[PDB]
Amino acid sequence: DEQLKPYPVKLSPNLINKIDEVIKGLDLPVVNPRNIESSVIPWAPPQANWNTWHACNIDEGELATTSIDDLSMDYERSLRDRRQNDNEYRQFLEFREKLPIAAMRSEILTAINDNPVVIIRGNTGCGKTTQIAQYILDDYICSGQGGYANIYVTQPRRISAISVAERVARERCEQLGDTVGYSVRFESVFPRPYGAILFCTVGVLLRKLEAGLRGVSHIIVDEIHERDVNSDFLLVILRDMVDTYPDLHVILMSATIDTTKFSKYFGICPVLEVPGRAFPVQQFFLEDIIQMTDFVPSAESRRKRKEVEDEEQLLSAEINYNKVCEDKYSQKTRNAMAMLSESDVSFELLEALLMHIKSKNIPGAILVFLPGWNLIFALMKFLQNTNIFGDTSQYQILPCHSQIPRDEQRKVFEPVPEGVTKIILSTNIAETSITIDDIVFVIDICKARMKLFTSHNNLTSYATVWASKTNLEQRKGRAGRVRPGFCFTLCSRARFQALEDNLTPEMFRTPLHEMALTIKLLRLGSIHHFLSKALEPPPVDAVIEAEVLLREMRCLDANDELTPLGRLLARLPIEPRLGKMMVLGAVFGCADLMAIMASYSSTFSEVFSLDIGQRRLANHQKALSGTKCSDHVAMIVASQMWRREKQRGEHMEARFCDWKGLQMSTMNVIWDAKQQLLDLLQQAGFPEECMISHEVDERIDGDDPVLDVSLALLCLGLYPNICVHKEKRKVLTTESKAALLHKTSVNCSNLAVTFPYPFFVFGEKIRTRAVSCKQLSMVSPLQVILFGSRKIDLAANNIVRVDNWLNFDIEPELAAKIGALKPALEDLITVACDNPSDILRLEEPYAQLVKVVKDLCVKSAG
């Protein structure tokens, strides 16, 4: 299929002349543009005049001459004073004494002392993380070597690290940074140089590795059973380092996984198993809820589900275990099974579940393992819409994710008077080692939002995929760690019986560009050798594809595979492609818009709050995008009014957030990520004069070069996710794959709407029985050739193919000019990154290139 392309028909001769003078300034190739070892982290025992965390020689202060030996006796005296004066500390030791870990503490200490690497196994939350580091540090203190202890603990998520560090601080009745502190994204609270534990996430520790691990005696990797890519990376690093350095100790932690493989990973090392107080959890599946609550789906809801299903299946393995049932259950239960769908979770079933749990009248917080952010927000809006469940003094919902605003994360752990039965709507990542508070009932939807695919192919997919048996067991044991509780799993018993033993491990289902960037950054040589030395090698096709995609675009200062050299190519906490796009936007003077759109594309949360039911866009939901009919333009307008309203009032801006879309959490996340990116660039040498915010007026349709260039380099940022609007909602993605526009996007309409330019770019592609497209931006064809290009088959085809997938006339001379301009843009990127302090004042040809691109970027074509 093929859309139209041009709204007008006109080319301005002056623009062509400017392109000619720019192309002749640098003598760019005048031709049809179809042309063209493993290091180890240094280690050394702790010693004076050196800081362990910052890899600096302290300098200045009372520690410039005090030896570690004096600090040892100082710590002995301090601990004796703590034991003899701090009654609360003694009470905390008494509390720790009756933990199951304390009985085996002596054996644990002996094993750690006598062996360099030890795997510790036990139920998650039984007292591994909050106790092993304290035991190691206290053993080193009481042994006369207090200053020689420097323990790193690696929780899997930011929230886990922060909460565990604060809990450990609460146990020791001390503030953060004395001997316990956290090191996560957006913030760090560093501890004292000698004798301290720094609870830092795996990524943070990997970042710290660039400075060396001198002065670190113990590293405790936590929750290796999660088996995410970061933990595997850290395990490889620690295994190699311990192989090189014998004096270092490494402590691993597990919940339940094959012991023999992890033992053999170190040539057989001790595995210690210490149970906890796992009161038992009674598993009740969807059958029991149906037979108890008499769940009869409503006709209106039924009609909505069948109409939606008929709608998505119009685009042309459903065994549907929700029909299989035993003869014990009543006939009405089997019917209720028949008119329920396992593909999507019905809010009525959840409401019935919560009503039944309330009827139980058993105190205890309730956890819901929802798969995705969108479902979390939709369920929060439902349960706040409901009068019964919207009671402020009786019910409360606190979503629990790693990268939600910090205030909400703090609110998650904060206790409540009496009891409110917190409904913690969280995903699977936030389930371990935190314990939040007393947890009794788990409402496990039994779905996991596993990002599919590997390597550059399709670059994005966020289908909601069924969980596995091991995750079900872990989430069941997550409940009843206060009183025997119940794991109200939501599926048929046949579906559970057919559930897989475990998911595919995260390392084969994730891209390896960031892993390669980290390997080069810390100087661990080639990818092939390191991954052959890894816990399990990746497919070689995936490795080579990751290498070629990371080397094709400029995110590493490598001579065909050397390194990223210094910094500012893997330091960005965003995808490399978005980092390149945002650097280019900083070059063009549109750094603020580029940072906010990079944050929005990196945060797949919705920006418009859809109503409970009636899944569509209201009249007061599309006016933010104005005449541009673009998601990102609407983002900019909403964010600008957001700044104005947060400057002007607090409760009135809170109520203003009840206007068109305007989800609080998404705006907080995008603003914080944009601010972090801009601050990182300011620290990277780029001047602040080019990061000035520019107000965007959506209503006016015409000349606005800054917005045009932003919506342009978004095409470069989200390469190659370019979709073409055909009619109504159905569109086509690369390789002629059918897709549907999400109801969240502004461009969606129920009529035969023909947009002025039918070409769109998207960042999210949710996979279901059909294909959905989210975050749809309406980009003019000029931008499409400007950043999708490809080549026009002049060999008698006359069908003018560009961007490979799509096609129509762009006057191929101009297309060849952009083809020659592509390496000019790459060279501009290289020059800008070489001298971050000289971007605003470059040589005349680069300024001419920036100007000609900016005034070619005008969406007008006549």
Structure tokens at 628: 């541009």
Burial of 301 (0-12, 13-18, 19+ CB in 10 A): middle
Q: Cβ(491)–Cβ(448) under 8 Å?
A: no
State whether 109 and 250 are in the same domain: yes
The continuous run of DSSP H or E covering 170 comes out as helix 158-171
Cα separation of 774 and 745, whole Å? 6
Burial 427-446 (b: 16+ CB within 10 A, else e): bbbbbbbbbbeebbbbbbbb
In this structure, what DSSP letter does residue 265 have?
T
- Residue 252 pairs with which residues in a beta bridge? 119, 221
In this structure, what DSSP letter does residue 36 have?
-
* Residues in contact with 395: Cβ distance below 8 Å, sequence separation at least 6, in sequence order: 383, 389, 420, 421, 423
* Residues in contact with 192: Cβ distance below 8 Å, sequence separation at least 6, in sequence order: 177, 178, 179
* 563 within domain boundaries: no
- Residue 722 pairs with which residues in a beta bridge? 761
* 808 within domain boundaries: yes
Residues making up the binding site: 125, 127-130, 222-223, 481
Cis geometry, peptide bond prior to residue 720 (ω within 30 degrees of 0): yes
Full 3-state SS string of 774-789 = ECCEECCHHHHHHHHC
Place of tokens 């960005």: 572
Cα separation of 168 and 199, whole Å? 10
Cα separation of 427 and 434, whole Å? 14
Torsion from C-alpha of 433, 434, 439, 444, nearest 10 degrees:
-70
Tell me the residue type at 253: M
Of 324, 487, 458, whose CA–CA distance to 734 is shortest?
Answer: 458
Place of tokens 């206007």: 659
* DSSP line for 296-321: ---HHHHHHHHHHHHHHTT------G
Phi-psi region of 702 (alpha: psi -120 to 50; beta: other; left: phi over 0): left
* Domain final position from 506, 522, 539: 506
Of 788, 725, 787, whose CA–CA distance to 757 is shortest?
Answer: 725
Tell me the residue type at 754: T
Structure tokens at 32: 């049809």
Residues making up the binding site for ATP: 125, 127-130, 481
Structure tokens at 465: 């995929």
**Residue length of the chain:** 862
Torsion from C-alpha of 501, 202, 579, 827, nearest 10 degrees:
-110
In this structure, what DSSP letter does residue 481 have?
S
Of 132, 316, 340, 110, whose CA–CA distance to 223 is shortest?
Answer: 132
Cα separation of 834 and 793, whole Å? 37
Helix or strand or coil: residue 24? Answer: helix
* 747 within domain boundaries: yes
Burial 288-297 (b: 16+ CB within 10 A, else e): bbbbebebeb
What's the CATH number where 156 sits? 3.40.50.300
- CB-based contacts of 748-756 (< 8 A; 24+ apart in sequence): 748/616, 748/617, 750/616, 752/727, 752/728, 755/629, 755/725, 756/7
Of 677, 676, 720, 517, whose CA–CA distance to 583 is shortest?
Answer: 677
Q: Cβ(341)–Cβ(369) under 8 Å?
A: no
Phi, psi values for residue 183, rounded to 5°: -135, 100
Tell me the residue type at 491: C
Helices 781-788 and 812-834: angle between axes, nearest 10 degrees: 60
For residue 80, the Cα-to-chain-centroid distance in whole angstroms is 44
Structure tokens at 770: 């059909």
Cα separation of 135 and 131, whole Å? 6
Q: Cβ(3)–Cβ(725) under 8 Å?
A: yes
State whether 82 and 170 are in the same domain: yes
Place of tokens 């026009």: 792
State whether 19 and 106 are in the same domain: no
Burial 351-382 (b: 16+ CB within 10 A, else e): bbbbebbeeeeeebbbbbbbbbbbbbbbbbbb
State whether 233 and 287 are in the same domain: no
* Residues in contact with 719: Cβ distance below 8 Å, sequence separation at least 6, in sequence order: 577, 787, 788
Structure tokens at 193: 């140089």
Cα separation of 31 and 62, whole Å? 68
Q: Cβ(44)–Cβ(214) under 8 Å?
A: yes
How many other CB atoms are there within 10 angstroms of residue 181's CB atom? 23
For residue 282, the Cα-to-chain-centroid distance in whole angstroms is 33
Distances in Å between the Cα of 630 and the Cα atoms of 594, 639, 661, 721, 853 are 15, 14, 14, 15, 21
Question: How many Cα atoms are found within 13 Å in the side-chain-facing hemisphere of 762?
Answer: 31
Q: Cβ(164)–Cβ(155) under 8 Å?
A: yes
Of 834, 836, 771, 784, whose CA–CA distance to 810 is shortest?
Answer: 784
Burial 745-777 (b: 16+ CB within 10 A, else e): bbbbbeeeeeeebbbbbbbbbbbeebbbbbbbb
Question: Could you give the angle at the alpha carbon of 327 between the alpha carbons of 325 and 332, nearest 5°?
Answer: 70
State whether 389 and 249 are in the same domain: no
Structure tokens at 516: 């390669």
Place of tokens 């275990």: 321
Q: Cβ(200)–Cβ(154) under 8 Å?
A: yes
* Residues in contact with 836: Cβ distance below 8 Å, sequence separation at least 6, in sequence order: 568, 681, 684, 685, 686
Cα separation of 397 and 420, whole Å? 10
Helix or strand or coil: residue 43? Answer: coil
Place of tokens 């599919």: 452
Q: Cβ(789)–Cβ(818) under 8 Å?
A: yes
Distances in Å between the Cα of 167 and the Cα atoms of 70, 71, 163, 562, 841 are 30, 26, 6, 43, 51
Torsion from C-alpha of 545, 548, 551, 556, nearest 10 degrees:
30
Phi, psi values for residue 807, rounded to 5°: -170, 135
Strand duo 759-761 + 777-778: pairing = antiparallel
CA torsion sign, 314 to 315 to 321 to 322? negative
Largest Cα separation within the chain, whole Å, is 92
Burial of 320 (0-12, 13-18, 19+ CB in 10 A): middle
Helix or strand or coil: residue 486? Answer: strand
- Residue 439 pairs with which residues in a beta bridge? 365
Structure tokens at 609: 């709050």
Of 785, 821, 786, 783, whose CA–CA distance to 23 is shortest?
Answer: 821
Cα separation of 772 and 783, whole Å? 23
* 683 within domain boundaries: yes
Q: Cβ(738)–Cβ(770) under 8 Å?
A: yes
Cα separation of 51 and 688, whole Å? 32
CA torsion sign, 106 to 109 to 114 to 117? positive
Cα separation of 739 and 210, whole Å? 43
Helix or strand or coil: residue 834? Answer: helix
* 561 within domain boundaries: no
For residue 781, the Cα-to-chain-centroid distance in whole angstroms is 31
Q: Cβ(774)–Cβ(766) under 8 Å?
A: yes
State whether 586 and 496 are in the same domain: no
How many other CB atoms are there within 10 angstroms of residue 533's CB atom? 15
* DSSP line for 47-75: -SS-BTTTTB---SSGGGT--HHHHHHHH
Q: What number of H helices and E strands is found in the chain?
A: 30, 21
Q: Cβ(509)–Cβ(477) under 8 Å?
A: no
* Residues in contact with 753: Cβ distance below 8 Å, sequence separation at least 6, in sequence order: none
After which residues, if any, is the chain broken (C to N > 2.5 Å)? Answer: 36, 316
* 493 within domain boundaries: yes
Cα separation of 136 and 148, whole Å? 11
Burial of 396 (0-12, 13-18, 19+ CB in 10 A): middle
Phi, psi values for residue 744, rounded to 5°: -70, -35
Structure tokens at 542: 């995936």
State whether 328 and 264 are in the same domain: no
The continuous run of DSSP H or E covering 514 comes out as helix 513-521
Q: Cβ(637)–Cβ(624) under 8 Å?
A: yes
Cα separation of 175 and 73, whole Å? 22
* Domain final position from 484, 506, 528: 506
Tell me the residue type at 733: T
Distances in Å between the Cα of 435 and the Cα atoms of 267, 439, 476 are 34, 8, 13
Helix or strand or coil: residue 792? Answer: coil
Q: Cβ(357)–Cβ(397) under 8 Å?
A: no
State whether 647 and 678 are in the same domain: yes
Indicate the number of domains in the chain. Answer: 3
State whether 292 and 269 are in the same domain: no
Alpha helices (runs of H) in 278-437, residue ranges in sequence order: 286-293, 299-312, 331-338, 347-360, 373-385, 406-413
CA torsion sign, 98 to 103 to 104 to 105? positive
Cα separation of 223 and 121, whole Å? 9
Phi, psi values for residue 494, rounded to 5°: -65, -40
Phi-psi region of 748 (alpha: psi -120 to 50; beta: other; left: phi over 0): beta
Cα separation of 190 and 622, whole Å? 46
CA torsion sign, 220 to 224 to 225 to 231? positive
Domain of residue 252 covers 62-273
What is the Rg, in whole angstroms, of the alpha carbon atoms belonging to the chain?
Answer: 29
State whether 349 and 265 are in the same domain: no
Cα separation of 375 and 370, whole Å? 7
For residue 62, the Cα-to-chain-centroid distance in whole angstroms is 42
Of 474, 475, 534, 483, whose CA–CA distance to 508 is shortest?
Answer: 534
Place of tokens 């004798």: 195
State whether 461 and 583 are in the same domain: no
Q: Cβ(520)–Cβ(563) under 8 Å?
A: yes
* Residues in contact with 769: Cβ distance below 8 Å, sequence separation at least 6, in sequence order: 312, 313, 343
State whether 688 and 586 are in the same domain: yes
Tell me the residue type at 757: Y
In this structure, what DSSP letter does residue 719 have?
T
Residues making up the binding site for Mg(2+): 129, 222-223
Cα separation of 563 and 551, whole Å? 11
For residue 339, the Cα-to-chain-centroid distance in whole angstroms is 36
Structure tokens at 118: 């030890």
For residue 75, the Cα-to-chain-centroid distance in whole angstroms is 40
* 105 within domain boundaries: yes
Place of tokens 């004395």: 178
CA torsion sign, 187 to 193 to 197 to 201? positive
Question: How many Cα atoms are found within 13 Å in the side-chain-facing hemisphere of 36?
Answer: 8
Tell me the residue type at 586: A
Distances in Å between the Cα of 613 and the Cα atoms of 5, 348, 384, 833 are 36, 12, 14, 49
Cα separation of 177 and 585, whole Å? 38
Beta strands in 147-277 (DSSP E): 150-154, 180-184, 187-188, 196-200, 218-221, 249-254, 271-273
* Residues in contact with 312: Cβ distance below 8 Å, sequence separation at least 6, in sequence order: 740, 768, 769, 770
* 398 within domain boundaries: yes
Helices 68-85 and 87-97: angle between axes, nearest 10 degrees: 90
Cα separation of 771 and 858, whole Å? 32
For residue 574, the Cα-to-chain-centroid distance in whole angstroms is 9
In this structure, what DSSP letter does residue 767 have?
B
* Domain final position from 489, 506, 523: 506
Torsion from C-alpha of 62, 64, 69, 74, nearest 10 degrees:
20
For residue 252, the Cα-to-chain-centroid distance in whole angstroms is 24
